[PDB]
Amino acid sequence: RELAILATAENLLEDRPLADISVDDLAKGAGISRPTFYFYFPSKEAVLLTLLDRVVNQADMALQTLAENTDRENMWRTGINVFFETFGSHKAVTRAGQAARATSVEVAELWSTFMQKWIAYTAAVIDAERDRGAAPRTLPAHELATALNLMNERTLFASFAGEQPSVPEARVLDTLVHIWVTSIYGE
Amino acid sequence: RELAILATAENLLEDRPLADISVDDLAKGAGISRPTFYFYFPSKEAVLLTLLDRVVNQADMALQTLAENTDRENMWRTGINVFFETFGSHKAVTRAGQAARATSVEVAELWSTFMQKWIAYTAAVIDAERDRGAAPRTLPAHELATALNLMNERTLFASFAGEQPSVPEARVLDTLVHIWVTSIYGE
Numbered sequence: 001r002e003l004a005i006l007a008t009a010e011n012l013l014e015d016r017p018l019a020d021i022s023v024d025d026l027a028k029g030a031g032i033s034r035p036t037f038y039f040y041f042p043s044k045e046a047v048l049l050t051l052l053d054r055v056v057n058q059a060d061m062a063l064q065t066l067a068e069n070t071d072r073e074n075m076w077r078t079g080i081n082v083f084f085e086t087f088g089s090h091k092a093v094t095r096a097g098q099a100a101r102a103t104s105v106e107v108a109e110l111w112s113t114f115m116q117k118w119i120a121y122t123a124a125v126i127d128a129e130r131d132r133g134a135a136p137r138t139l140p141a142h143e144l145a146t147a148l149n150l151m152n153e154r155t156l157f158a159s160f161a162g163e164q165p166s167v168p169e170a171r172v173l174d175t176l177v178h179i180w181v182t183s184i185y186g187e
Numbered sequence: 188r189e190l191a192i193l194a195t196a197e198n199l200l201e202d203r204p205l206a207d208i209s210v211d212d213l214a215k216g217a218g219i220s221r222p223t224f225y226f227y228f229p230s231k232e233a234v235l236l237t238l239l240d241r242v243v244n245q246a247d248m249a250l251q252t253l254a255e256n257t258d259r260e261n262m263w264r265t266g267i268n269v270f271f272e273t274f275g276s277h278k279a280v281t282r283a284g285q286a287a288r289a290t291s292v293e294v295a296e297l298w299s300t301f302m303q304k305w306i307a308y309t310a311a312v313i314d315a316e317r318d319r320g321a322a323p324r325t326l327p328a329h330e331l332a333t334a335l336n337l338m339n340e341r342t343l344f345a346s347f348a349g350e351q352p353s354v355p356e357a358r359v360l361d362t363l364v365h366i367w368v369t370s371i372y373g374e
């Protein structure tokens with residue numbers, strides 16, 4: 001019944017904003033009453049927070065899998081691809097979750113916590129490439145990592161939402177990989 | 188009295204969100220009654236739209252000034268600096284204007300129109316560098332320009348807002364210039 005509420009919310013977010021989805025719709029979709037809804041979640045906003053938490057954690061576990069186990073361009077492409085495929089498979093939760101950063105402190109804090117982790121891991125790998133002599137000591141690794149991660153956040157999510165302007169979804173992986181590799185390996 | 192309403196709104200946006208500013212506050216600050224306010228603007232949202240329009244147009248005119256008139260790194264740094272200084276001098280209008288993109292179609296359309304223009308100008312200069320043989324033919328110019336402009340949007344505004352995470356404001360110009368120059372000139 002928890003999973004039924006989450007699946008219903010993800011289904012309805014594909015068709016309309018969270019503001020245009022009510023607890024009755026989630027309750028109905030999940031085959032339960034409204035007071036029964038309130039047993040699993042305090043609000044429709046808590047439903048989105050759980051969906052976002054699951055997508056973020058799936059991306060994070062996929063990146064951990066790569067980290068524990070090719071040329072440098074392919075290494076970066078495989079890592080960026082974790083976020084392209086994971087968020088790209090959950091576009092409605094991505095879109096609604098990003099919009100909720102403005103109005104929900106728990107969604108802002110969830111997004112902020114994982115961004116810090118992904119930036120720290122990006123910088124650790126750039127520093128390892130510098131240590132082994134494959135990357136030059138240009139910018140501070142952590143500052144370069146921050147700007148590249150913020151680029152990917154804005155550019156992936158604009159592509160997925162079909163924003164004007166955006167890189168077409170079929171060109172965004174190649175675009176971001178070029179900018180990562182040239183900025184990490186370039187003097 | 189129009190300029191008094193705009194100056195009052197920019198002053199109060201430095202201390203609190205647009206939601207926590209009422210027409211009475213703008214009216215009072217500007218030395219006029221509330222019905223007199225409604226003669227100049229239909230809403231506090233129209234006040235923000237005008238402030239944003241002025242900041243965007245000041246950036247756009249500053250970039251036109253450069254365009255009509257040094258090494259390649261300095262050329263890019265001077266252009267990025269137009270946005271760093273212009274938006275950096277109007278942080279409260281930047282922050283509130285970006286937040287209003289979610290709730291106001293005219294603010295979203297204003298932002299979208301100028302982003303398209305700045306991306307088209309970025310691509311035209313990359314193509315000119317390619318034509319003269321200074322930049323290699325890597326990514327499609329317009330796709331590279333889009334991702335670099337979206338990076339700058341996200342990274343500048345995160346820095347100005349002191350977001351977690353963000354590049355410190357005193358490091359963000361150098362950070363963005365490195366990524367622009369390596370990605371435009373790098374193979």
Ligand SMILES: CCOC(=O)Cc1nc(-c2ccc(S(=O)(=O)NCCC(F)(F)F)cc2)cs1
Nearest residue numbers: 066067075079080083118121122125149152153
């Ligand atoms: C030996 C293993 O090394 C690797 O796999 C290569 C690596 N890739 C990453 C990495 C981190 C963040 C992004 S990201 O910038 O796309 N996500 C945040 C933004 C988003 F969440 F919104 F996408 C993309 C790639 C770190 S290390």
Ligand SMILES: CCOC(=O)Cc1nc(-c2ccc(S(=O)(=O)NCCC(F)(F)F)cc2)cs1
Nearest residue numbers: 253254262266267270305308309312336339340
């Ligand atoms: C011969 C003259 O050539 C030049 O001056 C070098 C040039 N710079 C630009 C340029 C365009 C957009 C940004 S930007 O990406 O920072 N703004 C959008 C995002 C923002 F609005 F949010 F900042 C930064 C630089 C285009 S051509």
